[PDB]
Structure 1
Amino acid sequence: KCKKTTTCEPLKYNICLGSVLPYALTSTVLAEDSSSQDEVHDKLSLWSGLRNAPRCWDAIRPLLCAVYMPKCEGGKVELPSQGLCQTTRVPCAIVARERGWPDFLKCTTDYFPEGCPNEVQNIKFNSAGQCEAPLVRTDNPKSWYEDVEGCGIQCQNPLFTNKEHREMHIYIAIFSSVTIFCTFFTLATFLVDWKNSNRYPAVILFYVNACFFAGSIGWLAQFMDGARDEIVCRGDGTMRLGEPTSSETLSCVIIFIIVYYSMMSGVIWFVMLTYAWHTSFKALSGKTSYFHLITWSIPFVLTVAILAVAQVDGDSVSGICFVGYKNYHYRAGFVLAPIGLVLIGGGYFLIRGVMTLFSARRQLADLEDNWETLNDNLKVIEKADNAAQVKDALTKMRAAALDAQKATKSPDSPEMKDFRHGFDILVGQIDDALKLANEGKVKEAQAAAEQLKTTRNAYIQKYLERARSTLSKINETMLRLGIFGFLAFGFVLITFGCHFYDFFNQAEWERSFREYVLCEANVAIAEQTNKPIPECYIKNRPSLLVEKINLFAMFGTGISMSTWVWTKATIIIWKRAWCRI
């Protein structure tokens, strides 16, 4: 009979000599030189050396597959046919010459019954139409998926259909367009006034927007007439993997270099910005030539490293080439680590900056408090009847004015000498009015308070109104740094979240995809043999919404840094260049 009784075990390898197996179970009973599937892989590795004889290899492939890795299903294994065995004797007679034929490979009808339907005869080892979606026939050995011969992994992402590709593409279109023209607006602002806007750290924003401009250029390069397929796909319609590979158009690695280098420089310029802010608050242009070197070297070294390990992969969905798609331990290495360190450092100099800021924010506010006390107490004194209120409020004025005088790089400067003298006059007159108030003389002290008013205006109002507008500037800086802080931290948190999700479930997504590939590989043979075919699908796939969020995060960063130039002071600068008369 064409069937033998044995226990079916799962295929440890779903490929038989470069050809996908349409079944999932096998048995090592027919392979009388093997007891386990590991042994089977060893013996087939021994048979592998016969591939240098295409004439024999072509004819011995189906026999070897039908014997060593047969289809087991429901406790039954199908034995290879007599004809199949006879198709091997004539061309592979060489095997009989050197070492002879194994007894289980001899065409004895007990091993190879006559007229038995075999599942392998349907399989074509040289793929004319064997290549089944998501695989495309490529004769280039650098594109072949795993060990499979003739078939390569298709270019377009086999996890998302066209209907999703168009969606994500128009999404990226919109966002990257907004970013490219916003960044272009910032650039144009700091460029038309290149003579007046070239200052630190105001030019650091210009550099950030420059980087995020180049990056968005790289992101938009995929929208030309047939450029996308030129960047993402190889010459044989298989997705570019492990780039840069030899003898392939550099249309991919260029885009990768653009996107990645521009991104990394664009996010190290953040650290430079925070440092520049801290040093600006702590007080200069002595280290202004050293920031460049870091911000251009580190992304360069990183990019060169990625090109050195050749881990540039092409994505049809995003429409670009980026690091660590296939191997997710590279994206976490070259994206999450630098961005993370950037977050740490920039955060450090941010909080340092707002500490250097908070230390003065309290001082100025205290001086203002003293002034407040002076004003309200003068309000009470000028308009009062009881001579106790005058004494009290004059004492309070004395305390407040004394406390204000005890404030501060040179305490011996002529300004500090003068400022304290005014409070000497004020405190003195306050004490005179105090002497008047103690003796019960109400209206005399009240009349001696107007002296305090005119003296307040003359000697104190100067420095006060000088340090009155600063509390607005300091608060504006504080709140805009609050903005930048709680925004950048948000973006980093979100992108770290997305990247971590993909990093988490990529271990399962590959499993699902592989199972799917095997399933459709079964469908291929199952169709052209009038056999019942099973519906195949992907068990689980990456969420498009997550990628949407990540893109929204990075492009959101690209937009939020372009918004910084959007001020009322900018709009008028444009007019100076061409207003004429």
Structure 2
Amino acid sequence: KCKKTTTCEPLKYNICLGSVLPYALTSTVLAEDSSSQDEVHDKLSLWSGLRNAPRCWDAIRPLLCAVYMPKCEGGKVELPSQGLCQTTRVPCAIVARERGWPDFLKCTTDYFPEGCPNEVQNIKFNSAGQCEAPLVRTDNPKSWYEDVEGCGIQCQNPLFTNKEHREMHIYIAIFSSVTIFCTFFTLATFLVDWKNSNRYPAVILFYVNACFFAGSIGWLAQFMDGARDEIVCRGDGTMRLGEPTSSETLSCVIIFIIVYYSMMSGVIWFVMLTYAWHTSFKALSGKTSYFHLITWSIPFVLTVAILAVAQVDGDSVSGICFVGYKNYHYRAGFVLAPIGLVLIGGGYFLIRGVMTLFSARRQLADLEDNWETLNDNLKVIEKADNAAQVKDALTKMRAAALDAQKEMKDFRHGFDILVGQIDDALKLANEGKVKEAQAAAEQLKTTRNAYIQKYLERARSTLSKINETMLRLGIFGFLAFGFVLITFGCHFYDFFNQAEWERSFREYVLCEANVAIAEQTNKPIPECYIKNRPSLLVEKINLFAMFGTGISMSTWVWTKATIIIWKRAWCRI
């Protein structure tokens, strides 16, 4: 009979000599020189050396597959046919001459029964129609998926359909457009007033938006008539992976360089921003030429390193080329690490900045507290009947003014005068003279205005400036940290389940490989699908995060003080 009784075990390799196996279970019983599938793969590695003789190889492939890796299903293995074995004798006669034939490969009808249907005869090792979606026939051996011959891994992302591609593309369209013109607004502002806006750290924002403009450009590049497929796909319609490979158009690596470099410089400029703020608070342009070198060296070195390991991959959904898609331990290395370090540094100099801020914020408030005391005490003194209230309030005034006394010598002199006059009024009030002290408090009023009000209203305005700065730092801090937290979350999710998505994808590929033969042989065909895939909402979130940062830094230039600056250049008469 065409069937043999043995125990079916799973394939350790789902490929037979560059051809995908349409079945899932096999048996090592027919390979009489083998006992395990390791041995089988070894023997096939020995038979591999025959590939230098294509004339024989063509005819011996199917036999070798039907023998060493046969279909096992429900305790049965189908034995190869006599007709199949006879097609090996004539051309592979070389095997017979140099070392002879193995006894289990000799065409004795007990090993090869006559007229037996074989699953292998259906399989084509010249992949004319063998290549099955999500795979496409390419005859370039640099695009061949794993060990499969003639088949390449298709260009468009096989985890999301076109219905989702259009979606994400219009999403990225809108967002990146908002960013590309917001950053242009912010550039134009600091550019038209290049003479008056070129200061540090106000030019650091300009540099940030410059970077995030350059990047959004590369993000928009994929929307031209046929540019997307030029960036993402190879010449043979198979997605660009491990770029830059030899003899491929640099239409990918250029976009990668843009999107990555602009991004990284764009986030190191954050650290430079926080430092510049801190040192601005601590009091200059001595280190202003050294920030540059850092913010341009580090992204360069990183990008060059990525190009050195050649781990640029192409995504059709995003429509760009970026680091560490295929191998996700590179994305964590070149994206998550620099961003995290940026978060740490920028956060450090932020809190240092608000310490440098907090220390004065209390001082000015204390001065305001003393002035708050003086006025209300004068309010009580000027309008009182009992001469105990006058004594009391005068003492309190003395305490406050004394506490406030603790170009500068003039300021202290004023409070000398105030304390003195207050003590005079104290002497007057102690003796029970109510209205004499009350009248001697108007002296305190006019003196308060004359000698003290200057330095006070001088330091009255700063509490608005300082609080505004404090709250805008309150914006930037809890904004940037939120963005970093979110993008770290997304990247960590993908980082987490990319170990599973590849499993599911592979199983799916094998399934469709089964479907291929299952259809053109009038055999029952099983439905194939992806068990699990990346969430599109997560990618939505990440994009929203980075573009949201790109927009929020362009929002900074949005002031009413800016709007009028535009008029000066061309208002004329």
Give the shorter-chain TM-score range: over 0.9
Please state how far the C-alpha of 1:126 moved relative to its aligned partner: 1.0
Counterparts of 2:74 and 2:389 in 1: how far apart (Å)?
106
Please state how far the C-alpha of 1:558 moved relative to its aligned partner: 0.1
1:400-425 C-alpha deviation (Å, 9 max, x unpaired): 000001xxxxxxxxx11000000000
Counterparts of 2:256 and 2:376 in 1: how far apart (Å)?
66
Please state how far the C-alpha of 1:281 moved relative to its aligned partner: 0.2
Instruction: Work out which of the residue numbers 450, 463, 486 in structure 2 matches 1:494.
Output: 486
1:111-147 C-alpha deviation (Å, 9 max, x unpaired): 0000000001100011001100000000000000000
Counterparts of 2:434 and 2:33 in 1: how far apart (Å)?
122
1:283-314 C-alpha deviation (Å, 9 max, x unpaired): 00000000000000000000000000000000
Question: Is 1:234 matched with 2:234?
Answer: yes
Q: Which residue of 1 aligns with 2:428?
A: 436
For residue 420 of structure 1, give the secondary structure of its aligned residue in structure 2.
helix
Counterparts of 2:511 and 2:217 in 1: how far apart (Å)?
40
Counterparts of 2:225 and 2:174 in 1: how far apart (Å)?
18
Q: Which residue of 1 aligns with 2:329?
A: 329
For residue 105 of structure 2, give the secondary structure of its aligned residue in structure 1.
coil
Please state how far the C-alpha of 1:441 moved relative to its aligned partner: 0.4
RMSD: 0.4
Counterparts of 1:49 and 1:162 in 2: how far apart (Å)?
43
For residue 251 of structure 1, give the secondary structure of its aligned residue in structure 2.
coil
1:72-115 C-alpha deviation (Å, 9 max, x unpaired): 00000000010000010011000000000000000010000000
Q: 4+ residue stretches of structure 1 with deviation over 6 A?
A: none
Counterparts of 2:208 and 2:454 in 1: how far apart (Å)?
40
Q: TM-score scaled to structure 1, two decimals?
A: 0.98
Please state how far the C-alpha of 1:340 moved relative to its aligned partner: 0.3
Gaps of 5+ in 2: none
For residue 252 of structure 2, give the secondary structure of its aligned residue in structure 1.
helix
Counterparts of 1:194 and 1:64 in 2: how far apart (Å)?
75
Q: Which residue of 1 aligns with 2:402?
A: 402
Counterparts of 1:102 and 1:258 in 2: how far apart (Å)?
60
Question: Is 1:366 matched with 2:395?
Answer: no
Counterparts of 2:433 and 2:164 in 1: how far apart (Å)?
89
Question: Is 1:527 matched with 2:524?
Answer: no
Q: Which residue of 2 aligns with 1:483?
A: 475
Counterparts of 1:330 and 1:87 in 2: how far apart (Å)?
49
For residue 289 of structure 1, give the secondary structure of its aligned residue in structure 2.
helix
Please state how far the C-alpha of 1:473 moved relative to its aligned partner: 0.4
For residue 129 of structure 2, give the secondary structure of its aligned residue in structure 1.
coil
- The alignment of Structure 1 onto Structure 2 pairs a total of residues equal to 572
Please state how far the C-alpha of 1:386 moved relative to its aligned partner: 0.5
1:425-483 C-alpha deviation (Å, 9 max, x unpaired): 00100000000110000100000010100000010000000000000000000000010
For residue 239 of structure 1, give the secondary structure of its aligned residue in structure 2.
coil
For residue 317 of structure 2, give the secondary structure of its aligned residue in structure 1.
coil
Any residues of structure 2 matched to 1:125-524 within 5 Å, and which? 125-405=125-405, 415-524=407-516
Counterparts of 1:237 and 1:477 in 2: how far apart (Å)?
54
Q: TM-score scaled to structure 2, two decimals?
A: 1.00
Please state how far the C-alpha of 1:66 moved relative to its aligned partner: 0.3
Counterparts of 2:392 and 2:321 in 1: how far apart (Å)?
77
Counterparts of 1:230 and 1:420 in 2: how far apart (Å)?
75
Counterparts of 1:448 and 1:151 in 2: how far apart (Å)?
102
Counterparts of 1:478 and 1:222 in 2: how far apart (Å)?
41
Counterparts of 2:3 and 2:484 in 1: how far apart (Å)?
61
1:353-386 C-alpha deviation (Å, 9 max, x unpaired): 0000000000000000000001111111110011
Counterparts of 1:47 and 1:283 in 2: how far apart (Å)?
79
1:212-240 C-alpha deviation (Å, 9 max, x unpaired): 00000000000000000000000000000
Please state how far the C-alpha of 1:2 moved relative to its aligned partner: 0.4
Please state how far the C-alpha of 1:491 moved relative to its aligned partner: 0.2
Percentage identity across aligned positions?
100
Gaps of 5+ in 1: 406-414
Please state how far the C-alpha of 1:245 moved relative to its aligned partner: 0.4
Please state how far the C-alpha of 1:532 moved relative to its aligned partner: 0.3
Counterparts of 1:126 and 1:427 in 2: how far apart (Å)?
105
Counterparts of 1:375 and 1:81 in 2: how far apart (Å)?
112
1:160-213 C-alpha deviation (Å, 9 max, x unpaired): 000000000000000000000000000000000000000000000000000000
Counterparts of 2:105 and 2:568 in 1: how far apart (Å)?
92
For residue 313 of structure 1, give the secondary structure of its aligned residue in structure 2.
strand
